[PDB]
Design a protein around this ligand. Sequence first.
Ligand SMILES: Nc1nc2c(c(=O)[nH]1)N[C@H]1C(=O)[C@H]3OP(=O)(O)OC[C@H]3O[C@H]1N2
Ligand SMILES: Nc1nc2c(c(=O)[nH]1)N[C@H]1C(=O)[C@H]3OP(=O)(O)OC[C@H]3O[C@H]1N2
Lengths: 136, 136, 77, 77
Amino acid sequence: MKQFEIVIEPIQTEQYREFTINEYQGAVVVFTGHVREWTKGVKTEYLEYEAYIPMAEKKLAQIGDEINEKWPGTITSIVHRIGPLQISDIAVLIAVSSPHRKDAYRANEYAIERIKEIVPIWKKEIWEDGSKWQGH
Amino acid sequence: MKQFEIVIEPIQTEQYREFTINEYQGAVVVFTGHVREWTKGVKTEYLEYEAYIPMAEKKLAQIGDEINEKWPGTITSIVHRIGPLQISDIAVLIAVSSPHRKDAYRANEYAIERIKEIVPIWKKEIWEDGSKWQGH
Amino acid sequence: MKVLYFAEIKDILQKAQEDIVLEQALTVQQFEDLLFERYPQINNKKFQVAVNEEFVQKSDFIQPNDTVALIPPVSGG
Amino acid sequence: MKVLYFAEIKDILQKAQEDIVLEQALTVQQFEDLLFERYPQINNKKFQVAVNEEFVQKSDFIQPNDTVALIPPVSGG
Ligand SMILES: Nc1nc2c(c(=O)[nH]1)N[C@H]1C(=O)[C@H]3OP(=O)(O)OC[C@H]3O[C@H]1N2
Ligand SMILES: Nc1nc2c(c(=O)[nH]1)N[C@H]1C(=O)[C@H]3OP(=O)(O)OC[C@H]3O[C@H]1N2
């Protein structure tokens, strides 16, 4: 298990909490992004994720550095899955430990916003009658 | 597992995430509170939580309701441990799922705030020189 | 009436609970007066009172068969 | 120079990489220019360019040996 990783296997979640804990930390926040079935109108069959892997892994490492700078005392771990994901599968997991609770919440929310901004990962939404790569 | 529970036994964590998941939920945020050895120079040997169990369980469910009120679509689960707790042991876990990520983070952070405010639970800091019950 | 004690008050009073017989109902205020005349060593300690697992005001009433709980400043999480 | 395509561009172009011989170093802008002439069918698609796994300005140079990736709007998480 790397601190920052792109994987093809289902994400084993609890080991990421463990990585971030030590005696100085009193808080851990874990965020998991799951595939939703319904509603921008027509039901999602599944999601296909792909990545430019080495650079994607680097950009995740970079977000960890930004978090260390902005919130010292934190430890961050991030993993993203690729390939076809089913309804409710974990696409992404972010774990941030910290001495006190607020930094953990802040750094964790920072991470997910930065992933959506700078990491070369792309999702394709497939449904019965078609499919389309997403932007933003 | 109860959705809102006080436990003596070590908290087993993955199940609380799983309780909150369904096809509508895009994000789960889980907060764990861990016993800290060092607090800005000060050394903790161990902690000792006690509680007014039936009231504390009522009050935790009341927070679930408040969250459902303020962030419709959320599912929430909360467990708090009592008794003597060692360094890095999980004293509290808070799991919130929501269709969207912002509600998940907001709702989780509200929950921990409210627990510190209303729920009848008390921690006793033990150090090598003595001990003391904490206030706010 | 079952009185319950927790945290520092449990420690001071050297007891976890007790039963006080009440002939008639009385206000939370009158209950505190009773408690402090019995236990001057806790007359300077902060707490809220819970009657049957809900927080109450000083003008609220305690019945003889009620359960009452002295809730010192909470410190959960 | 190794060129890497992803997402919608990978699908339009039916391929994930190709090799393109550059006589000399080109600015990012010139390379996009070359790409649109070579591939009319993607000149309405938005992308940044990454050289050796780094984002770059349009006036930065691509060396003949560099690896160049077309990064469409990202949709991770
Ligand atoms: N030794 C020691 N460890 C602690 C706490 C504490 O009060 N003493 N608070 C617990 C909390 O409720 C949270 O408080 P906090 O200040 O939000 O920091 C994170 C958590 O740390 C926990 N770990
Ligand atoms: N079907 C589907 N599932 C998804 C996302 C999505 O866009 N479509 N966004 C992913 C995210 O990155 C997070 O953003 P979000 O959409 O704000 O909600 C939580 C997460 O849901 C995730 N799961």
